[PDB]
Design a protein around this ligand. Structure first.
Ligand code: GTP
Ligand code: MG
Lengths: 431, 79, 610, 50, 64
């Protein structure tokens, strides 16, 4: 009744959504075939008169190998059999295969399913895309999609929970080619961009939690819990409720600084929950450490420009005000002149839920936060240096000019990132 | 069951008019009352050992660990 | 001390290695192996003289033609000897221990005049040796494997009493001729034209004219031992599906073939055509023919013994059991006639007295760990190694429910509350979990993570209020139910296997690897006394009756022990199998004691008064 | 509910008294069984002193 | 009691050049083609047939 549309494009998108769509089944009573046994489910699941509940999500991959895990796994009766659009051959780390000649085939099908779902919601509030920067289809299919979706619908909000490539570790070779090209799309036809990376979730997975050998089925559950915290107020009740424009207006000052980080506060094991007191004042303070960033930067060497929060659980706002006053008093956290408030609080009246087999405890208080900070320009400096060190000797560019892409758009996205890195420091300097 | 002669001749005649050729009256009207371990259950989806997802158990028998991995910066790392 | 009770109702079978079943030529008793011994069954099921020895798993059986001697090899560690043992068939006495090989022994065979035996040994260090029976020693030996070919598997003598065949493992087929005065065996090779098969069974005709080889590719090869050349090819157009695993002969020239996909075919030499075919249960690995001729027996890989008539080819199964390590029997409450036995991929529901199998339920290829009944007859819960907890319908094997992601490792121990509402699980992770069941759904309440290591057993009080978790950490916790916290810890020097309550709930008793049966005060975890195991074994299963004066204990050696409760009185009838006994329960009528030996053997004895 | 609210503290005390009595009585009866057992270390010392 | 309509069947085939945006001031039928030169021999007696529907997504399209 306050609906959302959440697309998962690529492989990483689909494999995160595989871990997103049982947390929603466990928050409500929806068992996996779609039959609740016993309307706060409304934003995520439609209902059908045989009892059967159906999701609101589209899954696309140009190769059929990963969707066919879902299609015969544990969640095959849940999804509608045209929410699962497949193909034959992938894009294989090339942006041109996906956004160009071979990728212009499934776009009409994904737009039909976007239209056929969005034409049945009573109230539409926006888009949650899950697409990987690291992909060949996950970063070209979405750039083919958004340039047509924003012509069709236009003013509705776009939020992307994407996977930023880590500064040291990386698992492909033409990532500095595929990262730079999609930010010619996401600057103009997009309105927010939450990035995460993979090395820091391993960090926070082994230090705050006794997991040896951490994997993707450990990454995707925490990034599912983050989106279930951001989508809390559209589904539940509480003191201060923040809607999908009531923060996305708070979070974008200038129309090219729209790149905020994310942080989830209580991450702890099943044993050592008994020994920490777990108060509002300490799990507000856990948010502002340099150790607990899911994206590998130090926020201290930059400045938080604008912030937000998404509370849950058993909080009462006097504690939150006493926490925020101390955060404003502290000096590890530095701000700018042009936002003297720098805060935004929502509340809710629901605890976190514990998916079975997850390695988290049933904490009651829960915090998320989402920060517009200028210290992501350091990570864009580190991936900025990677590009011209490969375009200097014109490496790998035949694989791009073969599948329909001209050479000059490398220079175009070069000066696009040059203008963006000009913009961050020019809006972060004092007056 | 039968209420008259019409449903006697057609309720059970057992005489295809198309196929029975050069017949007789008694061969037309013929009804049918004149004529007359160890058990087991098998799972449907043959599962695989290799495609399981619960954890990745340690190479060393980490109840009494064999090559000491401590937690980074002090303490136990495993379980 | 140590009075022998009585022994009855042998259940298991080993049909996992080829040609384990061989009826002796008086056609009354069937010998067949088990996990570490041999068994002889009569027509009246008179279990007779488990012939003791071999130190480890028997793997190969060969019988003298007259019907007086039997010889069986075994398998040990790398760089260890392995002993053929010559037995008798009249006074079941270990005559000769013949221990001269490396690693293990792949094949044994007898000569038709009873003087000679032959042995093939070694997966890597492959050699053939010839033993004499007049003096229990070796005549001569040689490498029975073609260099620049591969390895070899099986051997058989002639009826010329002097020449014997070593059979292709990967394509070496070699005849040897034996001469006494030089004391030697001479190798010649049977040259084949372009054929290179993987031969995997062998038999010999009566008049030494031809011997037959069954191959992995599926075609039956006839041979000529005089020409030392290939004699005949196999079938084209419907070669058998898997490898040809079991070939038998007749007095006439009609060979009985059997393939490891569970197919039995009558076959003749010019045209290998299925005159009489019967599809059987599981892969066939043994054919043994009664000397009368008109009835024979089939041993299968899944342990089914098939008595099949030669005329009209009708079968009748006579023995069934599991085919991996078995674990965790549980009786129903109030009924002494039913068994549940669970193992790798499988669960079976038995009878007790007449030993029939009533139903069988398969998970495809995963591993089971624990089985339990409900307090009523509504359902049977089980805990499996796939990270899942299942529960099944009592008849017809319907899956009522499964639990998707229970623990991080395989769920090990499971327990039933007496009000049929709660199921307690512990697994190798140590996250002890509680499951509230309902008609519609089943949910988890709270995860108790005291432990640091595995969980062995979970046992709850007569009226639910408290429980206990036997674990291999060194700590056995008593938890309370009505609140989810801990009362008391047993901290001890034993990797625990079995923890049992005393009837009337005074004290709790622990066992394990360190062989100290220890009674424990129910408060403070204060130790009372320690009574030792047998000698240098281990112990895995305890049992107390309804009253609380009898005390049954079973462990890593062959010994099951009846004990008095208050004082240490032992009563040994543990003369059975030394395959490591892992669980043991008494019937609720106090009539039988039933133990599961790891290599599949479920044995029940009568009840003694303690 | 309001009629029986006047005695709320006496049942709270009675439950603690009953649980402590039952626990200590279980301890004493198990000590009776322990003292009737014969293969104890201190009992063997007493028999050796005899 | 209601009856199955042909507006539903023509929509599940997908013939209508119609679209929806739930604009905040009110739900609006976005038109992909010019309204002034439609085929009124096709599209009026099917919208008039879709008048007969009570369930959510089609009554709005018929009326607007
Ligand atoms: N968190 C998380 N990241 C994943 C997962 N699977 C893949 N990734 C990330 O995806 C990045 C590469 O993009 P891919 O998804 O593999 O490529 P793609 O989108 O399938 O595009 P093609 O290669 O053309 O098929 C890697 O850097 C991974 O970090 C996952 O299950 N969880
Ligand atoms: Mg892919």
């Amino acid at each position: 009744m306050r609906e959302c549309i959440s697309v998962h494009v690529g492989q990483a998108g689909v494999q995160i959504g595989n871990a997103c769509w049982e947390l929603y089944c466990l928050e409500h009573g929806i068992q996996p075939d779609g039959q609740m046994p016993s309307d706060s489910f409304n934003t995520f699941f439609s209902e059908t008169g045989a009892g059967k509940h159906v999701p609101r999500a589209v899954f696309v991959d140009l190769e059929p190998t990963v969707i066919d895990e879902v299609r015969t796994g544990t969640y095959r009766q849940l999804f509608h059999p045209e929410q699962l659009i497949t193909g034959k051959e992938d894009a294989a780390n090339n942006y041109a295969r996906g956004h160009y000649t071979i990728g212009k085939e499934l776009i009409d099908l994904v737009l039909d399913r976007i239209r056929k779902l969005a034409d049945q919601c009573t109230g539409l509030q926006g888009f949650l895309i899950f697409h990987s920067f690291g992909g060949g289809t996950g970063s070209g299919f979405t750039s083919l999609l958004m340039e047509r979706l924003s012509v069709d619908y236009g003013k509705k909000s776009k939020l992307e929970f994407s996977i930023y490539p880590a500064p040291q570790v990386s698992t492909a070779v033409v990532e500095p080619y595929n990262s730079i090209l999609t930010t010619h799309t996401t600057l103009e036809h997009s309105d927010c961009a939450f990035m995460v990376d993979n090395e820091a979730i391993y960090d926070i997975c082994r230090r705050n939690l006794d997991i040896e050998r951490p994997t993707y089925t450990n990454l995707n559950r925490l990034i599912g819990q983050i989106v279930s915290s951001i989508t809390a107020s559209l589904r539940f009740d509480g003191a201060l409720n923040v809607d999908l424009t009531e923060f996305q207006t708070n979070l974008v000052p200038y129309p090219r600084i729209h790149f905020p980080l994310a942080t989830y506060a209580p991450v702890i094991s099943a044993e050592k929950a008994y020994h920490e007191q777990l108060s509002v004042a300490e799990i507000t303070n856990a948010c502002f450490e340099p150790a607990n960033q899911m994206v590998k930067c130090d926020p201290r060497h930059g400045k938080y420009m604008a912030c937000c929060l998404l509370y849950r659980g058993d909080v009462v706002p006097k504690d939150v005000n006493a926490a925020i006053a101390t955060i404003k008093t502290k000096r590890t956290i530095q701000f700018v002149d042009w936002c003297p408030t720098g805060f935004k609080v929502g509340i809710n009246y629901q605890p976190p839920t514990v998916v079975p087999g997850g390695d988290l405890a049933k904490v009651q208080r829960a915090v998320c936060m989402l920060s517009n900070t200028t210290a992501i320009a350091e990570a864009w400096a580190r991936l900025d240096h990677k590009f011209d060190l490969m375009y200097a000797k014109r490496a790998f560019v035949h694989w791009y000019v073969g599948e329909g892409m001209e050479e000059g758009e490398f220079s175009e996205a070069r000066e696009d990132m040059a203008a963006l890195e000009k913009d961050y420091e020019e809006v972060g300097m004092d007056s | 069951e039968i209420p008259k002669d019409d449903l006697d001749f057609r309720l059970a005649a057992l005489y295809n008019h198309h196929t029975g050729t050069f017949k007789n009256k008694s061969e037309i009207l013929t009804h049918q009352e004149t004529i007359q371990n160890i058990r087991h259950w098998i799972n449907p989806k043959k599962e695989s050992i290799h495609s399981i997802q619960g954890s990745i158990v340690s190479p060393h028998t980490a109840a009494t660990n064999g090559g000491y991995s401590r937690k980074n910066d002090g303490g136990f790392f495993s379980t | 001390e140590a009075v022998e009770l009585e022994l009855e109702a042998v259940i298991g079978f080993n049909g996992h290695v080829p040609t384990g079943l061989k009826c002796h030529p008086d056609q009354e008793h069937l010998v067949y192996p088990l996990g570490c011994t041999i068994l002889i069954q009569a027509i009246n099921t008179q279990e007779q003289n488990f012939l003791h020895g071999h130190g480890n798993n028997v793997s190969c059986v060969a019988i003298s033609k007259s019907g007086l001697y039997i010889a069986s090899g075994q398998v040990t560690f790398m760089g260890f000897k392995a002993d053929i043992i010559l037995w008798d068939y009249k006074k079941r006495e270990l005559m000769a221990r013949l221990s001269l090989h490396k690693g293990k022994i792949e094949a044994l065979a007898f000569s038709p005049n009873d003087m000679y035996l032959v042995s093939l040994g070694g997966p890597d260090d492959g050699s053939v040796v010839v033993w004499s029976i007049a003096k229990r020693e070796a005549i001569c030996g040689s490498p029975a494997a073609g260099l620049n070919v591969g390895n070899a598997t099986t051997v058989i003598f002639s009826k010329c009493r002097d020449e014997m065949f070593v059979t292709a493992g990967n394509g070496t087929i070699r005849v040897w001729e034996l001469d006494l005065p030089n004391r030697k065996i001479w190798p010649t090779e049977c040259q084949t034209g372009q054929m290179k098969r993987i031969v995997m069974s062998i038999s010999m005709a009566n008049d030494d004219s031809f011997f037959y080889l069954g191959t992995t590719t599926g075609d039956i090869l006839k041979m000529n031992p005089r020409t030392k050349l290939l004699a005949d090819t196999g079938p084209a157009k419907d070669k058998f599906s898997l490898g040809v695993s079991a070939i038998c002969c007749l007095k006439m020239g009609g060979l009985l073939v059997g393939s490891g996909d569970g197919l039995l075919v009558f076959c003749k030499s010019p045209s290998y055509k299925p005159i009489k075919k019967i599809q059987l249960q599981g892969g066939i690995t043994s054919i043994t023919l009664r000397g009368e001729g008109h009835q024979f027996f089939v041993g299968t890989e899944e342990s089914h013994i098939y008595r099949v008539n030669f005329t009209n080819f009708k079968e009748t199964l006579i023995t069934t059991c599991h085919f991996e390590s078995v674990e965790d029997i549980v009786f129903p409450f109030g009924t002494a006639e039913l068994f549940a036995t669970c193992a790798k991929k499988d669960i079976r529901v038995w009878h007790t007295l007449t030993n029939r199998e009533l139903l069988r339920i398969t998970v495809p290829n995963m591993t089971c760990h624990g089985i339990d009944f409900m307090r009523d007859g509504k359902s049977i819960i089980s805990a499996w190694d796939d990270g899942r907890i299942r529960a099944f319908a009592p008849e017809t094997g319907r899956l009522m429910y499964v639990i998707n992601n229970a623990h991080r490792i395989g769920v090990t121990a499971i327990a039933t509350t007496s009000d049929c509402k709660r199921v307690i699980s512990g697994g190798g992770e140590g996250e002890v979990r509680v499951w509230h069941i309902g008609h519609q759904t089943q949910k988890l309440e709270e995860a108790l993570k005291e432990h640091k290591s595995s969980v062995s057993c979970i046992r709850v009080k007569k009226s639910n209020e408290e429980c206990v978790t036997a674990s291999t950490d060194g700590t056995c916790i008593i938890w309370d139910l009505v609140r989810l916290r801990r009362n008391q810890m047993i901290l001890a020097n034993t990797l625990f296997q079995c923890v049992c309550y005393h009837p009337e709930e005074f004290q709790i008793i622990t066992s394990g690897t360190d062989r100290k049966i220890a009674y424990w005060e129910v408060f403070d975890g204060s130790v009372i006394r320690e009574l030792d195991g047998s000698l240098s074994g281990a112990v895995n299963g305890m049992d107390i009756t309804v009253e609380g004066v009898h005390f049954v204990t079973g462990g890593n050696d062959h010994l099951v022990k009846v004990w008095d409760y208050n004082e240490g009185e032992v009563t040994h009838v543990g003369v059975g199998h030394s395959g490591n006994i892992t669980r043991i329960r008494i019937s609720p009528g106090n009539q039988y004691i039933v133990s599961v030996s790891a290599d599949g053997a479920i044995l029940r004895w009568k009840y003694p008064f303690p | 509910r309001i009629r029986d609210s006047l005695d709320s503290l006496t049942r709270e005390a009675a439950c603690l008294r009953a649980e402590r009595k039952a626990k200590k009585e279980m301890h004493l009866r198990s000590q009776e069984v322990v003292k009737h057992w014969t293969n104890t270390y201190a009992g063997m010392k007493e028999q050796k002193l005899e | 009691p209601t009856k199955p309509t042909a507006f539903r069947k023509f929509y599940e085939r997908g013939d209508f050049p119609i679209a929806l945006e739930h604009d905040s001031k009110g739900n609006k039928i976005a038109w992909k083609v010019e309204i002034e030169k439609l085929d009124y021999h096709h599209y009026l007696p099917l919208f008039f047939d879709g008048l007969c529907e009570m369930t959510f997504p089609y009554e709005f399209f018929a009326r607007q």
